[PDB]
């Protein structure tokens, strides 16, 4: 029942600004102490900020890494938590999760990339076996995509299906593939890049 | 107060009990919490206040410890407990996290299934060509994939990625892509995917332009 939606994250050039919103629902907002937590592209987690309740007069604690650069804030009226990031360094490139108290409930997270390069929307290619070598498998390819993450989901006519999403291999221009196992006539992979790339290609 | 966690990587089969320890810089007074984070998913709380379990967390996830050192014992390891585990304290600001522990579900070794997929025409018109080979349902994770073009090893440019262990089978899966220019694709007519683990003979899948 308790849900936490994070929004407003994406590509932000260094020495810039970005604002992150954690829209909460399913519990009393003004009674809990809200924290933020980030995680590097492949490294471990890290605590960034915390905001206490109105009874504690909105006490805020920041980590020494973003001490003077970040600014947390909350609005218990609309039940949303905000984190304002200023003077963004390249090291801050991470995925940010908003969490409640000691971590009872976490969010889906939103990816923030601090880079000087430009968003290159993905180039999705179909992958099918050569005719005459029909097999119980298929897949799609997502080449030259920056920045993460790519939302690749599969829609097929056969009820039973098996889909496996592979990790994105890249640091400057990423690439990811995704396989499907024919279990149980056509299929399509819907790729979705954060700067509005709602595109898909079908294989039959 | 910073936290150090041990071990960094553990591997035990289904049913064997494991014990991850987490040390601290000082006395955090039972303000620690354990999280399980599966790959590409949000973390989930396991144990809070050193030993108190959380709702929905099964009873096999016994927490333990006191003072400046804490531990986490998982008896009867289920195949759905793969992933990394973190320890965080809440005594003093800043609330430092832990290093992490990659828990691999050890399983009986299995040979891979190799399927090779030829480059699409749309990519060929774009000026490049990438051949993708999918290896699924294999254990262990360590595998040697060598791409051969007309009988010549071409490991110069390849992008390999490993999926997380399947929740039930505890099996790994991998994708290997060979990216080359269109001029190179027309020059050579034979392309093969070779994977070497378990049995020395390499499960291979080849293709030709025609």
Author numbering:
A (entry chain H): 1 to 184, 188 to 207
B (entry chain L): 2 to 211
From the paper:
Here, we report the first crystal structures of the complex between a murine Fab/IgE (heavy and light chains naturally paired) that recognizes the allergen profilin from natural rubber latex (Hev b 8). This profilin is involved in the latex-fruit-pollen syndrome and oral-allergy syndrome and is highly cross-reactive. Profilins are involved in multiple cellular functions, such as motility, through regulation of the polymerization of actin microfilaments, binding proteins with proline-rich domains, and binding phosphatidylinositol, among others. The murine Fab/IgE 2F5 is a non-recombinant IgE obtained in response to immunization with rHev b 8 allergen.
The overall structure of the free Fab/IgE 2F5 at 3.75 Å shows three Fabs molecules per asymmetric unit. We could not model all the residues of one of the three molecules in the asymmetric unit, but the electron density was enough to model all CDRs and the backbone. We compared the structure of the three free Fabs in the asymmetric unit with the Fabs structure in the rHev b 8 Fab/IgE 2F5 complex at 3.04 Å. No changes were observed, showing no flexibility, or induced fit in the antibody paratope when the allergen epitope was recognized. The free Fab/IgE 2F5 elbow region is comparable to the complex’s structure at 3.04 Å (RMSD varies from 0.73 Å for heavy chains to 1.1 Å for light chains). The crystal structure of Fab/IgE 2F5 showed N-linked main glycosylation at the N189/F190/T191 sequon of the Fab’s heavy chain constant region.
